Symmetry: D3
Subunit: 266 residues, 6 copies
């Protein structure tokens, strides 16, 4: 179960309004790699785990934290939308606001009354297709590192998309929390790799066709990738290199379907 | 530019038909972590890179290979759908086929004439929201490892969802290629981390609020995560642990909107 | 069955072109609470009803009217897009048009030839996820009131997003029709509530766990909601108030899955 | 900010496994009117409100409670998926399990390792298009009543879709909470209607074309809706009835577009 | 404007219930090439046209007819869902119904109360991405023929998916209407091609790089397409054939981006 | 299987940067009728064909070619995004860039690091709902002609949306290839129509209700469509015309559902 305090985890107030930045920050709220993705991924993985409490609790700790970040971004967006222009009265006051209006999300005003959406900057709804919870935490801890890496990349970009020190203060906090989250998930990932194996899943080495497991296949005519040849892979075996990959599976010949399908193909 | 040969990269023919397995394999064709996701992610990242040829070429090599896998899965599904039941004539032949029909994707027959879709097993269309190309390859190589990890997990599951040795032959090849792909992307990842930093992006350490960068914050009441306390993180600094995270940001108070918005909130 | 007349239900011509307003009006055409949502919701509900003709006919009447509104908005958008700028030749005759171009939907010209789309202002396609038809008209009449409420709110906002008297004339008609629709659906709702109950569905009072049915649970630390304590709810029973809700369900412990799933969780 | 306890708000454990019921319950987790919709709608409205604390706090209290329900449904699904059949070895044990397998969501096993998804029963991802936060709480409290009405309908149906008394115990709790939520939102709605008006928004009566505001227009040839004629609407004015609605707007003619668009229309 | 009669265009009543067929028929209601696609495509194109009345009226005629077909399919689905099984009481009545339940759409009962949805058989929502209205009727009449072709193919398949004579009666009517619609759109198409050109758009022959306009480029190693070599194309010019297409564009190199983007690519 | 060369099929470098044009060109990369739609449609149809080699090879040839076009558009977008403005430093340098920034896709910088997305200009993800592969090549070749027609229309429009002769050079090549593709698919279509019939599918004429197969039904009150009366349709039979279409199916009456559904409809 959860409980809520009205107090934010950390400052989420800008020095001044900026509806263009509000639109950008929709990426962090409703985007592919945003806080809602973190929240739902870590919570769902956490609820699904039947294994080590170290990792189950880490996931629930972090997913709960991400809910605080969802709250923070939603709040920042609301502040940033204060006094945003949306109609003729605004243009009469200052005709240059047309530029601002053009760069805004039309739905911020029209749909939400100058409040945050749960979409990205382009109005694409957040969706669960952004979430991963597979049941395998070697894989999912890798995913969690990625989530925090792509997110911190975006936050770092956002930092260079404003000069507002209030917005930056919030971003600087999130950068630090994303460092922590990257690191904690990397530690979990490494412990899980040590237990189960470096290849995911770790218990299929005897099943796969081993002859092809360490061959770098040169499908594009650049030769940059030849530099991997002879390097030691993370499992201790060297990469080999195949200059000209071969087509080994023959030409397929699927059977024409039943006439009731009307598959008229010549 | 690309060229195509009709010969498959590797065998993609089953020993017998099975439209239920065809439906499962749609995950590998049109699903979140399937071959189309790999193909489009690695190619888009490859085309976007302005950096080291070692990695640009690796991405284009692999994206091109994934197109061969898309072809293989599409082919396997077509073979698996041969003679699949879809109407009363089939039930006249064998009434027990109603069970098979119930488990099939209705659109395999109706929409596609007993051929593959570009959807997942539940008819959800593949979409570009599954794809990541961020411009940062430290982040994106991590993503690529994840893609290959989730895919290999799914392929491993699929192996236990059939007894068809022809299907399994294809799966065993893909398991191996996914091993190679996981490993090559891990090597690239590690080299990029060595160059730019273990935290993504690596050039923000002096900007983030460092005091919060290594603190494990206990938001859920389990104590499993306390095991991380005092462990050395990948950047060489130890994690600290906060049993009771603090709300430091105050209670927000956003300015009510302009009356033209009709934001009647009491 | 339907028949069509080329005459619009009401005026839908703007006094002047304005492609930015065209973009805003896409909300009323292809948006979540737009006219297409009303049309499809009321017709689907109407076709699904097996109950009182008073309500079935109301739904079909209204859904049919909403098709006229879809036609009007589509028409208005087309007029608003007349002579809109879309390339270098336009800027040559008026360089100030760059600002207009920046705020336009690129697809209005490129995809549709300066005609309406069936997307919202952000380009997100209308979809049936916006539509409700549940089989229960106590629930669905409530939905219908909401549809007309959200729509009228948006129309009211649009009224303040233009000074075009032609656009406003159409909007003033839509405001009035949305008043009628809100009121007719409110009357239907109330009659249905009188027949079936104020709680939806009205025939489960003896099944639910009654002890929790009138308790306001204070999950957020604000005390505003305490003002509901002792107030008489619509079913005639007072609300009680629980300042500190309790977790009553225990800590779950789901069983680890079969090894074939490779659920490596530590 | 939020905090989490591992203890569930209320029991969420079935007496027996049942992966078909697991699939149904996905509606309550990832569906249109499910607990995630509640959680995100109430939290987003709550964060966006600048109005009376009575309602802002109510929203935050309830959105936080709905997170507990998301947790419960996710947990219930996990339990229900225990030991579910997913491959040939299950059929070897009991060939009759083919029926169960046919009815399952293939991704429960393949994608999630026999854990919950964030999709509906058909694998359609939850998305933010299900959420409303408009800025107007007269409209949005109506929405919230709908949310809880449609949800309670679905929970009532679910009660008749199982005989598992553990599942039913959870459902009975949710029915009761949905009663409370329906009622509290209805009270809020009524107080806000008193303050602002029964028509949303309540401050446009002088703007709308009043002649059309209380006319029931008979667009479908059934005569059931004529029963509204003469009834007193909720604003105190009687409905009138128009048996034969008229097309008042003329036949529109948009100008042909610029030749650079190539709008060849004959 | 539109008016509605309760009378269906043509019979849409089955002899018997069949919830599996109901699910199939959702393709015709909510699917990619179904009646809602026809309705919205032909109406949107019709409203958009500024050209010949012959075609504008044809589009509005047919779009209006498609609304009748949306009504028919919606109705047929409702009838087909009568008495459909959805819970333990049905299995007590007839345990063999488990098979039927497994093949049904879970949301038909749970969400819609055994009524139609506006989704396809897999629960994917109808969306406007299925609609085309481009402003060019040479293109769009081609699209309209495709819509009616794909639809008639599906209806033909549906005919072999049931033996119900009532269902078949409806299908036989739809087949015939789809014949008419294919033909009328083909005639419009041809007239428009005669006016504007066989290539769309017809007024760019002097702009394109003509040298590459009639060359069949053999990008895949099969030789079947060489049969086009020397055949006369529809514009009266012969196809030529290139066995080995050439890459003429060079190897691109984009400039590395601003460091504020953190594009760390090696 | 596929192989790749770094060399582009044809020039894809603009003379100069233009991030607004980059946004437009996203229609050709990730849009409904763009190159990814061609690529995936032609390849999937190719892989699914069991019919004449002429057509199967054509589809594989062309789908492979479209992959080169995907590469080209991706590359062109990357070049066009060079030096695009994205933050305060750019505005400090040149305040006039705010107009450009307002018209850009915010995600070009924030998500992709000034590289291409796989979305349309409005950020809507490319999805497989854009792709058709039905199993019937009479229908699908019609679809392929449409794809190339809509694409060539958009490319033609793009030509008038820039003065950059580098961009135009690429567009001029694509116009020519779209001519060839339109023509080759038209030729295939015509051969297939001669083999199977002009109506799709061609083997249903004795099943359909022939009395309705050549009647133009006047559902909209314009009389432009009466011009088709007496014209000879493509199958050799004249169209007839019905001024007043009749509703022949009666008023439906579906049975009220089981009480366990709670279908309270009055
Ligand atoms: Ca290479
Ligand atoms: Ca903890
Ligand atoms: Ca409270
Ligand atoms: Ca009526
Ligand atoms: Ca060839
Ligand atoms: Ca007519
Ligand atoms: Mn965060
Ligand atoms: Mn984080
Ligand atoms: Mn692969
Ligand atoms: Mn791979
Ligand atoms: Mn309306
Ligand atoms: Mn209305
Ligand atoms: Mn709840
Ligand atoms: Mn609730
Ligand atoms: Mn039709
Ligand atoms: Mn038709
Ligand atoms: Mn092309
Ligand atoms: Mn082409
Ligand atoms: Na505000
Ligand atoms: Na019924
Ligand atoms: O975070
Ligand atoms: O792979
Ligand atoms: O309306
Ligand atoms: O709830
Ligand atoms: O049709
Ligand atoms: O093309």
């Amino acid at each position: 179960m959860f409980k809520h305090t009205r107090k934010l985890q950390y400052n989420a107030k800008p020095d001044r309004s900026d509806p263009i930045m509000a639109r950008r920050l929709q990426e962090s709220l409703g985007g592919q790699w945003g806080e809602t993705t973190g929240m739902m991924s870590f919570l769902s993985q956490g609820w699904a785990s039947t294994g080590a409490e170290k990792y189950k609790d880490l996931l629930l700790d972090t997913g709960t934290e991400e809910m605080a970040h969802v709250e923070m971004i939603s709040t920042m967006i609301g502040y940033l939308l204060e006094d945003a222009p949306f109609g003729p009265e605004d243009l009469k006051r200052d005709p240059s606001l047309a530029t601002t209006m053009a760069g805004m999300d039309p739905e911020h005003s029209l749909v939400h009354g100058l409040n945050a959406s749960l979409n990205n900057p382009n109005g694409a709804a957040w969706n669960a297709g952004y979430v991963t919870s597979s049941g395998n935490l070697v894989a999912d801890m890798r995913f969690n590192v990625v989530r925090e890496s792509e997110a911190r990349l975006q936050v770092s970009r956002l930092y260079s998309m404003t000069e507002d020190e209030g917005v930056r203060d919030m971003l600087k906090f999130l950068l630090a929390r994303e460092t922590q989250h990257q690191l904690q998930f990397m530690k979990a990932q490494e412990e899980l790799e040590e237990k189960y194996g470096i290849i995911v899943p770790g218990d299929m080495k005897e099943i796969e066709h081993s002859e092809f497991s360490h061959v770098l296949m040169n499908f594009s005519d650049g030769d940059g990738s030849k530099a991997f040849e002879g390097q030691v892979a993370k499992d201790g075996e060297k990469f080999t290199y195949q200059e000209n990959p071969e087509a080994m599976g023959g030409i397929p010949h699927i059977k024409p379907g039943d006439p009731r399908l009307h598959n008229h193909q010549g």
